[PDB]
Amino acid sequence: QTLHALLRDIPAPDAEAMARAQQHIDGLLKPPGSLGRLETLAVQLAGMPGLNGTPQVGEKAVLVMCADHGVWDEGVAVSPKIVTAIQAANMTRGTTGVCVLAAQAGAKVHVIDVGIDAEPIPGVVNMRVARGCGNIAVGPAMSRLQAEALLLEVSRYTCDLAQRGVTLFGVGELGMANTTPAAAMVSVFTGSDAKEVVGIPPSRIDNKVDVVRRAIAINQPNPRDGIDVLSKVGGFDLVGMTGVMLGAARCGLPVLLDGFLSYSAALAACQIAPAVRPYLIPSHFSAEKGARIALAHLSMEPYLHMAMRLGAGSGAALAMPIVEAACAMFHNMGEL
Amino acid sequence: QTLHALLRDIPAPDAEAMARAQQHIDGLLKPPGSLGRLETLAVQLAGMPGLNGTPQVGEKAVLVMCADHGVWDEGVAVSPKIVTAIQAANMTRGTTGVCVLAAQAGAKVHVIDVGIDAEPIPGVVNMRVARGCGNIAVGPAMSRLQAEALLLEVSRYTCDLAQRGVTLFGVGELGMANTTPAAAMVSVFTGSDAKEVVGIPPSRIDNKVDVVRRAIAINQPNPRDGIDVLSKVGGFDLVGMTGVMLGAARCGLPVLLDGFLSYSAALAACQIAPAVRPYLIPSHFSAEKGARIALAHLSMEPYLHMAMRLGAGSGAALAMPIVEAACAMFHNMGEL
């Protein structure tokens, strides 16, 4: 540790730098509304202390958290368990969607195993808590201590990347059955009935919903304690994405979310540490049923409508040029 | 001429190449829905015969059409008339928003004067029809023959760019008072009351609406004749953007729209030549009040929600990396 110390040292956004960036933008010669949300984004970036008082992007990293879930035994996923392992390995060879989009964005992909139920995969960053987490339908995904330790380890990993020049992160995850704990967390944090947020054959959908309600009933997660929620009805992958958000915020740097899985982690992150929120930037509006509810509770309006799902960080990589665009306009446009 | 010949020679999309691209995508190893609309976009691109049977981007050009409007005399714009000239000149120095975004996208900006009411500006492409078009509130913007000649000239200019390697266009425009004729065209083509589509002080908004109704009443444009609509209640800038769309479609190549002004031109383009439609790609969802209605009539769902307005092609430039992204995923992802 300390996780207590990390949370309390997340900096506030720098109001003076935001005022100066807004003043700079006001001094630009431009039709009214011609920047749209690029204007608000540039000012948001200017407030993040790791960006040194100005909207800028240096190196970019997308962190893809990988883990398996004991709730897979409840029949809520169609694919066999080993697919998590095969995908993590493909990510190290650069052949997945997020890899290709990250390459387009000039970003590096960091594949992090935080709990794959397989032999370790050479080339993946090894932060494995256990070989898959507990089956949330019968008990907790993990101990409170395990969730806290993984939060600290990931947040430290993320912020240490600022020493190699990284100033913009994206977060994603992969793992068979991951959408079930994500929907549980979302239902718990937002108070929405499981049926409204459970990701999309009738009996199979019902089984998924019933499993979410069962996980919540058995575990009784406390919505006012984000770490309790993660440890009881989340998973290592979700804790991992929350850790990226905490680490970026601690570093005073931007992080792009991806889809619904990452929204659920962001809900937890902002419950644990409300000071995280000014560092989060949406990318895409996930096709998962629960996307609208989760984004509402984060007061977030995504920039991209790609009808995308299961991107494993692909949406965050796709939005990286949007962040670069707000910075180029800020620095490169002519003035009044 | 001939404009008749140009319209009839717009090629159909290549169904065999689309089938082959869909087959290729089906053979990619990917979670279900993980490409989202990148999948549909790659297949759409594969159908465009100027792309030679495969989703690809070579050189990129954003064409920014510039002109003044006699309806400016009706008090529907707040800025003085010369601003159109000052902006066209700034575009040649590379200091505007669309210039900066085009540079981010690796695209060249082509600034085309199709009717600025000022001395010619050195460095701008000169296709000027007249020094501003007629005041649509009292009569037609131009003659049918003038609209037809400018359509042909611009479409030829656009397609000739395919000889310098250009495979993806963006279209935009600038011109004081341009949003008034745009709203008139949109009301005429969609049958919506002017009050629903007139771009956003109460009396000033009413004057704008009243001027649109007056233009339509006096000119009696025929909605079943897109060239009639353009010549009577449009402007040189709108005819110019329609010409880009016709030229790209004739060349069998993609064109990215921008905001509401370009939607109004796209409505005209697709009325004149329905075969244009498969070549049009939305970029952003304009903040102008009439954006939703115009996009509905084009059956178009933009990828970007940037709350942007008066971009002069900036939205199309911002969406260019989205098109490149669909191509990179298509060619670079690993297979089953």
XYZ file of C-alpha atoms in Angstrom:
672
model
C 0.000 0.000 0.000
C -1.109 2.615 0.444
C -4.417 2.755 -1.426
C -5.715 5.217 1.076
C -2.762 7.475 0.197
C -3.213 7.004 -3.516
C -6.864 7.984 -3.424
C -6.309 11.065 -1.341
C -3.459 12.273 -3.544
C -5.450 12.298 -6.813
C -5.037 16.001 -7.815
C -7.941 18.362 -8.435
C -8.103 19.748 -12.055
C -6.122 22.965 -12.490
C -8.695 25.764 -12.793
C -6.093 28.403 -13.769
C -4.879 26.293 -16.736
C -8.471 25.693 -17.837
C -9.176 29.445 -17.694
C -6.067 30.111 -19.730
C -7.050 27.460 -22.313
C -10.582 28.828 -22.577
C -9.069 32.366 -23.016
C -6.815 31.024 -25.738
C -9.756 29.384 -27.521
C -11.872 32.589 -27.190
C -8.970 34.380 -28.935
C -9.152 31.998 -31.932
C -10.751 33.315 -35.133
C -13.542 30.847 -35.742
C -17.225 30.671 -36.610
C -19.365 30.279 -33.473
C -19.738 26.552 -32.514
C -17.245 25.456 -35.190
C -15.164 23.486 -32.648
C -18.152 21.960 -30.909
C -17.076 19.494 -28.201
C -13.451 19.746 -29.357
C -13.519 23.065 -27.440
C -14.764 21.515 -24.181
C -12.383 18.565 -24.605
C -9.328 20.844 -25.064
C -10.231 22.721 -21.912
C -10.826 19.435 -19.982
C -7.389 18.214 -21.080
C -5.824 21.574 -20.061
C -7.048 21.002 -16.469
C -5.267 17.599 -16.084
C -2.027 18.295 -14.207
C -0.009 15.547 -15.925
C -0.491 17.493 -19.216
C 1.522 20.444 -17.853
C -1.000 23.179 -18.355
C -1.781 22.562 -22.045
C -3.848 20.153 -24.204
C -1.241 17.770 -25.615
C -0.722 14.065 -26.486
C 2.676 12.346 -26.304
C 2.806 8.542 -26.219
C -0.458 6.553 -25.986
C -1.172 3.215 -24.405
C -4.175 0.998 -24.388
C -4.271 -1.367 -21.427
C -6.228 -4.545 -22.003
C -7.086 -6.422 -18.853
C -7.610 -10.209 -19.206
C -9.313 -12.638 -16.828
C -11.696 -15.599 -16.503
C -14.824 -15.883 -14.325
C -16.202 -18.782 -12.257
C -19.717 -17.577 -13.302
C -18.873 -19.082 -16.694
C -20.038 -22.356 -14.981
C -23.562 -20.862 -14.886
C -23.973 -21.123 -18.693
C -24.132 -17.354 -19.323
C -21.496 -17.364 -22.099
C -21.685 -19.307 -25.392
C -17.920 -19.668 -25.985
C -15.676 -22.200 -24.164
C -13.480 -20.899 -21.383
C -10.100 -21.197 -23.196
C -11.134 -18.491 -25.674
C -9.921 -15.918 -23.074
C -6.424 -17.465 -23.291
C -6.427 -17.718 -27.112
C -7.471 -14.037 -27.386
C -4.791 -12.844 -24.878
C -2.153 -14.711 -26.931
C -3.460 -13.152 -30.224
C -3.231 -9.766 -28.640
C 0.538 -10.335 -28.171
C 0.868 -11.105 -31.897
C -0.904 -7.930 -32.912
C -3.722 -9.520 -34.949
C -6.805 -8.462 -32.958
C -9.082 -5.473 -33.619
C -7.806 -3.377 -30.740
C -4.200 -4.052 -31.933
C -4.944 -2.849 -35.438
C -6.817 0.243 -34.160
C -4.106 0.988 -31.636
C -1.514 0.850 -34.501
C -3.654 3.249 -36.490
C -3.642 5.608 -33.506
C 0.157 5.325 -32.937
C -0.615 3.630 -29.560
C 1.010 0.607 -27.895
C -1.197 -2.178 -26.493
C -0.331 -3.497 -23.025
C -1.957 -6.971 -22.512
C -2.287 -7.643 -18.794
C -3.282 -11.015 -17.379
C -4.985 -10.305 -14.070
C -6.609 -13.709 -13.790
C -6.727 -16.000 -16.890
C -7.491 -19.601 -15.984
C -4.677 -21.101 -18.092
C -0.920 -21.379 -18.027
C 0.773 -17.957 -18.106
C 1.211 -16.685 -21.687
C 4.668 -15.604 -22.618
C 4.733 -11.947 -23.538
C 1.648 -10.931 -21.500
C 2.188 -8.728 -18.414
C 1.658 -11.063 -15.441
C -0.437 -9.663 -12.583
C -2.605 -12.776 -12.124
C -4.619 -12.905 -8.918
C -5.906 -16.482 -9.312
C -6.833 -18.816 -12.178
C -10.193 -17.088 -12.759
C -12.234 -15.376 -10.015
C -14.977 -17.005 -7.817
C -18.359 -17.778 -9.329
C -20.337 -14.709 -8.303
C -23.620 -16.681 -8.508
C -22.631 -18.634 -5.276
C -20.332 -16.270 -3.393
C -17.784 -13.485 -3.937
C -15.524 -13.064 -6.963
C -12.586 -12.450 -4.537
C -11.540 -11.179 -1.116
C -11.516 -7.505 -0.292
C -7.771 -7.712 0.152
C -7.246 -9.246 -3.334
C -9.271 -6.400 -4.968
C -7.328 -3.735 -3.043
C -3.955 -5.307 -3.908
C -4.792 -5.514 -7.657
C -6.107 -1.868 -7.644
C -2.756 -0.727 -6.186
C -0.616 -2.821 -8.504
C -2.462 -1.732 -11.660
C -2.696 1.946 -10.663
C 1.085 1.950 -10.041
C 1.770 0.224 -13.389
C -0.387 2.780 -15.195
C 1.134 5.892 -13.638
C 4.722 4.470 -14.115
C 4.000 4.543 -17.853
C 3.971 8.358 -17.582
C 7.796 7.939 -17.133
C 8.094 6.519 -20.611
C 6.335 9.517 -22.109
C 2.720 8.153 -22.073
C 0.151 10.935 -21.664
C -3.150 9.266 -22.877
C -4.444 5.897 -21.873
C -7.266 3.720 -23.190
C -8.700 0.859 -21.159
C -10.357 -2.399 -22.298
C -10.769 -5.996 -21.195
C -11.390 -9.490 -22.330
C -12.628 -12.599 -20.588
C -15.318 -15.193 -21.175
C -18.519 -14.421 -19.232
C -17.246 -10.835 -18.350
C -20.562 -9.136 -19.269
C -22.409 -10.808 -16.407
C -20.447 -9.266 -13.492
C -20.388 -5.967 -15.423
C -24.205 -5.940 -15.546
C -24.364 -6.872 -11.803
C -22.136 -3.901 -10.898
C -24.135 -1.538 -13.072
C -27.455 -2.718 -11.496
C -25.951 -2.292 -8.013
C -24.448 1.174 -8.578
C -27.371 2.685 -10.510
C -30.267 0.919 -8.681
C -31.614 -0.400 -12.040
C -33.399 -3.756 -12.208
C -31.067 -6.426 -13.697
C -33.481 -6.895 -16.666
C -32.737 -3.310 -17.841
C -28.945 -3.628 -17.992
C -28.279 -7.280 -18.780
C -26.570 -7.687 -22.078
C -28.319 -9.316 -24.953
C -32.633 -16.713 -27.446
C -35.251 -16.057 -24.672
C -34.357 -18.739 -22.125
C -30.651 -17.805 -22.396
C -31.375 -14.138 -21.749
C -33.529 -15.179 -18.706
C -30.767 -17.341 -17.352
C -28.345 -14.397 -17.614
C -30.779 -12.091 -15.759
C -31.559 -14.676 -13.086
C -27.830 -15.256 -12.522
C -27.263 -11.468 -12.012
C -30.066 -11.230 -9.479
C -28.771 -14.309 -7.705
C -25.219 -12.866 -7.475
C -26.552 -9.667 -5.954
C -28.921 -11.492 -3.549
C -26.176 -13.856 -2.283
C -23.385 -11.265 -2.011
C -25.366 -8.211 -0.808
C -22.830 -5.767 -2.266
C -22.944 -2.254 -0.745
C -23.390 0.433 -3.533
C -21.726 3.053 -1.274
C -18.508 0.983 -1.192
C -17.133 0.521 -4.735
C -14.393 -1.868 -3.610
C -17.024 -4.075 -1.874
C -19.008 -4.142 -5.127
C -15.976 -5.054 -7.238
C -14.778 -7.804 -4.879
C -18.208 -9.396 -4.461
C -19.993 -9.251 -7.868
C -17.189 -7.919 -10.184
C -14.130 -9.812 -11.514
C -10.308 -9.345 -11.771
C -10.689 -7.778 -15.228
C -13.141 -5.151 -13.928
C -10.903 -4.418 -10.883
C -8.004 -4.123 -13.354
C -9.813 -1.462 -15.480
C -10.774 0.427 -12.329
C -7.059 0.353 -11.336
C -6.085 1.941 -14.726
C -8.582 4.700 -14.076
C -7.288 5.306 -10.512
C -3.628 5.285 -11.756
C -4.328 7.688 -14.600
C -6.221 10.035 -12.303
C -3.418 9.776 -9.666
C -0.958 10.732 -12.502
C -3.250 13.656 -13.463
C -3.649 12.136 -16.984
C -6.562 11.334 -19.390
C -8.071 7.865 -19.830
C -10.479 6.901 -22.661
C -13.126 4.402 -21.698
C -14.247 1.753 -24.155
C -17.692 0.106 -23.884
C -20.161 -1.211 -21.268
C -17.621 -3.362 -19.366
C -15.454 -0.220 -18.919
C -18.473 1.890 -17.939
C -19.125 -0.545 -15.088
C -15.491 -0.213 -13.967
C -15.774 3.631 -14.242
C -18.881 3.569 -12.066
C -16.829 1.743 -9.386
C -13.798 4.035 -9.886
C -15.900 7.225 -9.416
C -17.713 5.758 -6.353
C -14.334 4.883 -4.746
C -12.764 8.247 -5.697
C -15.052 10.956 -7.125
C -11.874 12.941 -8.024
C -11.288 10.324 -10.839
C -14.214 11.684 -12.888
C -12.531 14.751 -14.539
C -9.891 12.419 -16.033
C -12.333 10.072 -17.810
C -13.148 10.630 -21.509
C -15.851 8.548 -23.277
C -15.062 7.017 -26.667
C -18.009 5.050 -28.114
C -21.664 4.366 -27.266
C -21.700 0.595 -26.672
C -24.351 -1.588 -28.390
C -24.916 -3.446 -25.047
C -28.411 -2.959 -23.618
C -27.119 -1.400 -20.450
C -24.943 1.247 -22.108
C -27.466 4.102 -21.916
C -28.132 3.674 -18.170
C -24.470 3.360 -17.248
C -23.448 6.459 -19.337
C -26.303 8.466 -17.750
C -25.054 7.719 -14.319
C -21.599 8.891 -15.389
C -23.136 11.998 -17.049
C -21.251 11.021 -20.198
C -22.075 11.484 -23.842
C -19.844 9.398 -26.146
C -18.317 10.894 -29.265
C -18.613 7.768 -31.431
C -21.710 5.862 -32.426
C -20.271 2.736 -33.943
C -22.826 0.105 -32.721
C -19.800 -1.696 -31.367
C -19.661 -4.418 -28.688
C -16.846 -6.657 -27.176
C -14.225 -4.226 -28.568
C -11.627 -5.076 -25.794
C -10.360 -1.444 -26.004
C -10.994 -0.924 -29.691
C -13.395 2.021 -29.091
C -10.875 3.799 -26.861
C -8.170 3.337 -29.571
C -10.540 4.629 -32.196
C -11.135 7.817 -30.150
C -7.504 8.624 -29.623
C -7.326 10.749 -32.879
C -10.322 12.767 -31.465
C -8.195 13.721 -28.453
C -5.256 14.564 -30.754
C -7.687 16.603 -32.948
C -8.729 18.847 -29.959
C -5.036 19.426 -29.203
C -4.071 20.240 -32.843
C -6.972 22.704 -33.176
C -5.951 24.390 -29.876
C -2.349 24.820 -30.938
C -2.596 25.225 -34.656
C -5.615 27.416 -35.440
C -5.174 31.064 -36.397
C -6.325 33.860 -33.991
C -8.550 37.004 -34.137
C -21.920 19.063 -71.148
C -23.130 16.469 -70.872
C -24.798 16.375 -67.456
C -27.326 13.949 -68.770
C -24.433 11.636 -69.707
C -22.694 12.096 -66.394
C -25.771 11.178 -64.397
C -26.545 8.099 -66.411
C -22.970 6.832 -66.203
C -22.759 6.823 -62.382
C -21.914 3.108 -61.771
C -23.995 0.793 -59.602
C -22.101 -0.608 -56.520
C -20.277 -3.861 -57.267
C -22.273 -6.618 -55.545
C -19.620 -9.305 -56.201
C -16.904 -7.231 -54.455
C -19.230 -6.576 -51.515
C -19.955 -10.315 -51.214
C -16.252 -11.044 -51.294
C -15.553 -8.391 -48.622
C -18.337 -9.700 -46.397
C -16.902 -13.266 -46.874
C -13.480 -11.977 -45.914
C -14.865 -10.296 -42.788
C -16.851 -13.463 -41.845
C -13.500 -15.312 -42.042
C -11.913 -12.943 -39.481
C -11.440 -14.249 -35.930
C -13.353 -11.738 -33.861
C -15.892 -11.505 -31.060
C -19.426 -11.060 -32.436
C -20.213 -7.322 -33.033
C -16.625 -6.282 -32.247
C -16.317 -4.335 -35.531
C -19.738 -2.749 -35.279
C -20.343 -0.288 -38.133
C -16.707 -0.606 -39.233
C -17.905 -3.914 -40.756
C -20.750 -2.327 -42.745
C -18.498 0.580 -43.760
C -15.760 -1.751 -45.099
C -18.322 -3.597 -47.176
C -19.849 -0.291 -48.447
C -16.374 0.866 -49.495
C -15.719 -2.515 -51.204
C -18.753 -1.904 -53.473
C -17.446 1.471 -54.818
C -15.852 0.731 -58.196
C -13.169 3.435 -57.938
C -11.735 1.480 -54.942
C -10.898 -1.498 -57.191
C -12.738 -4.192 -55.334
C -11.281 -3.582 -51.854
C -11.721 -1.149 -48.917
C -8.733 1.182 -49.244
C -7.749 4.873 -48.838
C -5.023 6.535 -50.922
C -4.901 10.337 -51.086
C -7.688 12.382 -49.439
C -9.116 15.740 -50.356
C -11.562 18.008 -48.680
C -13.279 20.390 -51.078
C -14.511 23.597 -49.512
C -16.971 25.505 -51.632
C -17.138 29.298 -51.063
C -19.847 31.768 -52.072
C -21.945 34.770 -51.005
C -25.751 35.119 -51.030
C -28.009 38.051 -51.968
C -30.333 36.900 -49.110
C -27.691 38.373 -46.800
C -29.566 41.676 -47.569
C -32.548 40.242 -45.643
C -30.726 40.490 -42.275
C -30.564 36.721 -41.645
C -26.819 36.672 -40.851
C -25.077 38.600 -38.040
C -21.633 38.895 -39.687
C -20.773 41.397 -42.472
C -20.561 40.074 -46.001
C -16.744 40.306 -46.423
C -16.237 37.604 -43.781
C -16.755 35.024 -46.597
C -13.724 36.511 -48.407
C -11.558 36.744 -45.258
C -12.325 33.080 -44.421
C -11.558 31.855 -48.000
C -8.189 33.666 -47.812
C -7.428 32.113 -44.350
C -8.194 28.731 -45.767
C -5.345 29.239 -48.291
C -2.949 29.984 -45.412
C -3.888 26.835 -43.556
C -5.029 28.461 -40.289
C -8.714 27.465 -40.177
C -10.267 24.512 -38.327
C -10.881 22.410 -41.412
C -7.223 23.018 -42.475
C -5.871 21.809 -39.159
C -8.191 18.755 -39.135
C -7.399 17.978 -42.747
C -3.639 18.058 -41.855
C -4.316 15.685 -38.991
C -6.036 13.342 -41.444
C -3.223 13.563 -44.066
C -5.743 15.289 -46.421
C -5.297 18.293 -48.729
C -7.862 21.121 -48.649
C -9.091 22.444 -52.004
C -10.663 25.947 -51.524
C -13.029 26.644 -54.405
C -14.593 30.041 -55.025
C -17.883 29.376 -56.784
C -19.322 32.809 -56.112
C -17.624 35.085 -53.502
C -18.707 38.703 -53.835
C -15.169 40.145 -53.700
C -12.105 40.360 -55.883
C -10.723 36.909 -56.759
C -8.356 35.611 -54.050
C -4.998 34.467 -55.236
C -4.485 30.804 -54.494
C -8.199 29.852 -54.421
C -9.539 27.656 -57.258
C -11.620 30.015 -59.420
C -14.989 28.666 -60.582
C -16.983 31.817 -59.748
C -20.456 31.997 -61.250
C -21.232 35.593 -60.215
C -20.333 37.927 -57.340
C -22.802 36.253 -54.949
C -26.067 34.591 -56.045
C -29.545 36.278 -56.312
C -31.461 37.100 -53.154
C -33.725 34.070 -52.863
C -36.279 36.095 -50.845
C -37.262 38.048 -54.078
C -36.475 35.656 -56.920
C -34.114 32.826 -57.901
C -30.545 32.351 -56.685
C -29.509 31.699 -60.345
C -30.606 30.430 -63.750
C -31.115 26.760 -64.423
C -28.279 26.906 -66.912
C -25.845 28.412 -64.345
C -26.636 25.593 -61.836
C -26.171 22.905 -64.509
C -22.875 24.415 -65.715
C -21.437 24.617 -62.152
C -22.590 20.994 -61.399
C -20.674 19.804 -64.493
C -17.563 21.849 -63.806
C -17.315 20.775 -60.153
C -18.134 17.106 -60.823
C -15.371 17.042 -63.478
C -12.881 18.739 -61.115
C -13.679 16.210 -58.392
C -13.360 13.081 -60.521
C -10.109 14.439 -62.167
C -8.588 14.359 -58.678
C -8.830 10.547 -58.864
C -5.926 10.904 -61.404
C -3.686 12.300 -58.714
C -4.337 9.324 -56.467
C -7.313 10.749 -54.456
C -9.708 8.014 -53.324
C -11.713 9.731 -50.463
C -13.291 13.127 -50.574
C -14.833 15.345 -47.902
C -17.117 18.240 -48.779
C -17.782 21.520 -46.919
C -18.685 25.128 -47.613
C -18.495 28.627 -46.344
C -20.449 31.765 -47.095
C -22.290 34.401 -45.101
C -26.041 33.694 -44.885
C -25.551 30.092 -46.314
C -27.792 28.444 -43.670
C -30.907 30.162 -44.991
C -30.968 28.602 -48.495
C -29.881 25.293 -46.920
C -32.957 25.329 -44.656
C -35.191 26.283 -47.656
C -33.918 23.280 -49.648
C -34.375 20.940 -46.712
C -37.983 22.184 -46.137
C -38.723 21.751 -49.856
C -37.224 18.257 -50.224
C -38.563 16.786 -46.968
C -41.956 18.610 -46.844
C -41.140 19.933 -43.320
C -42.459 23.319 -42.188
C -39.650 25.941 -42.296
C -39.948 26.435 -38.485
C -38.730 22.831 -37.919
C -35.515 23.085 -39.944
C -34.458 26.721 -39.691
C -31.175 27.082 -37.944
C -30.961 28.725 -34.592
C -32.978 36.181 -30.133
C -36.717 35.583 -30.932
C -37.378 38.264 -33.551
C -34.187 37.265 -35.423
C -35.212 33.615 -35.527
C -38.692 34.707 -36.819
C -37.147 36.830 -39.511
C -35.053 33.845 -40.652
C -38.148 31.589 -40.789
C -40.261 34.201 -42.564
C -37.499 34.721 -45.144
C -37.384 30.926 -45.866
C -41.132 30.749 -46.365
C -41.018 33.815 -48.576
C -38.246 32.314 -50.770
C -40.261 29.146 -51.251
C -43.544 31.023 -51.901
C -41.959 33.347 -54.512
C -39.858 30.711 -56.303
C -42.223 27.697 -56.156
C -39.349 25.203 -56.378
C -40.364 21.700 -57.548
C -39.198 19.007 -54.985
C -39.151 16.371 -57.775
C -36.511 18.387 -59.677
C -33.363 18.807 -57.538
C -31.702 21.155 -60.029
C -34.815 23.415 -59.981
C -34.607 23.499 -56.178
C -30.897 24.348 -56.160
C -31.200 27.089 -58.797
C -34.236 28.742 -57.207
C -33.779 28.609 -53.388
C -30.179 27.218 -53.060
C -26.874 29.052 -53.707
C -23.587 28.519 -55.657
C -21.969 26.940 -52.585
C -24.771 24.362 -52.253
C -24.664 23.607 -56.027
C -20.880 23.251 -55.631
C -21.212 20.609 -52.840
C -23.820 18.753 -54.882
C -21.321 18.770 -57.806
C -18.625 17.148 -55.555
C -21.097 14.435 -54.663
C -22.060 13.826 -58.329
C -18.339 13.778 -59.377
C -17.346 11.372 -56.625
C -20.246 9.070 -57.433
C -19.426 9.295 -61.195
C -15.809 8.283 -60.247
C -17.203 5.393 -58.141
C -15.511 6.902 -55.021
C -16.534 7.740 -51.392
C -17.470 11.232 -50.193
C -17.834 12.221 -46.502
C -20.517 14.769 -45.809
C -20.005 17.424 -43.162
C -22.970 19.130 -41.443
C -26.462 20.502 -42.207
C -25.411 22.620 -45.225
C -23.932 19.445 -46.805
C -27.010 17.391 -45.891
C -29.121 19.852 -47.884
C -26.768 19.464 -50.864
C -26.910 15.625 -50.456
C -30.702 15.750 -50.491
C -30.499 17.555 -53.871
C -27.756 15.210 -55.164
C -29.808 12.058 -54.344
C -33.012 13.571 -55.848
C -31.124 14.398 -59.092
C -29.349 11.003 -59.179
C -30.471 8.326 -56.692
C -27.377 6.282 -57.741
C -25.255 8.874 -55.768
C -26.528 7.554 -52.414
C -24.258 4.450 -51.991
C -21.197 6.729 -52.268
C -22.162 9.107 -49.432
C -20.749 8.544 -45.919
C -21.939 10.662 -42.942
C -19.343 12.162 -40.604
C -20.917 14.170 -37.752
C -24.398 14.920 -36.384
C -24.700 18.694 -36.873
C -25.874 20.913 -33.967
C -28.202 22.798 -36.411
C -31.900 22.377 -35.607
C -32.656 20.814 -38.941
C -29.969 18.122 -38.793
C -32.205 15.310 -37.508
C -34.868 15.770 -40.220
C -32.367 16.026 -43.055
C -30.394 12.899 -41.896
C -33.680 10.950 -41.577
C -34.582 11.693 -45.116
C -31.149 10.457 -46.185
C -31.528 7.368 -43.930
C -28.174 8.297 -42.408
C -26.796 7.829 -38.936
C -23.618 9.865 -38.311
C -20.618 8.327 -36.598
C -19.582 11.446 -34.662
C -21.538 13.399 -32.098
C -19.440 16.492 -31.679
C -22.193 19.172 -31.253
C -20.437 20.928 -34.093
C -21.794 23.661 -36.393
C -20.293 25.861 -39.245
C -17.386 23.379 -39.570
C -16.802 24.199 -43.332
C -15.701 20.545 -43.858
C -14.144 20.016 -40.457
C -16.512 17.116 -39.576
C -15.728 15.307 -42.833
C -11.957 15.710 -42.134
C -12.444 14.444 -38.622
C -14.148 11.277 -39.953
C -11.469 10.411 -42.440
C -9.513 8.267 -39.846
C -12.817 6.307 -39.305
C -12.786 5.333 -42.986
C -9.076 4.428 -42.750
C -9.871 2.419 -39.555
C -12.460 0.209 -41.416
C -9.855 -0.429 -44.128
C -7.012 -1.277 -41.671
C -9.255 -3.694 -39.740
C -10.312 -5.379 -43.028
C -6.750 -5.876 -44.192
C -4.854 -6.296 -40.986
C -6.934 -8.440 -38.617
C -6.091 -12.100 -38.061
C -8.450 -14.863 -39.376
C -10.253 -17.970 -37.979
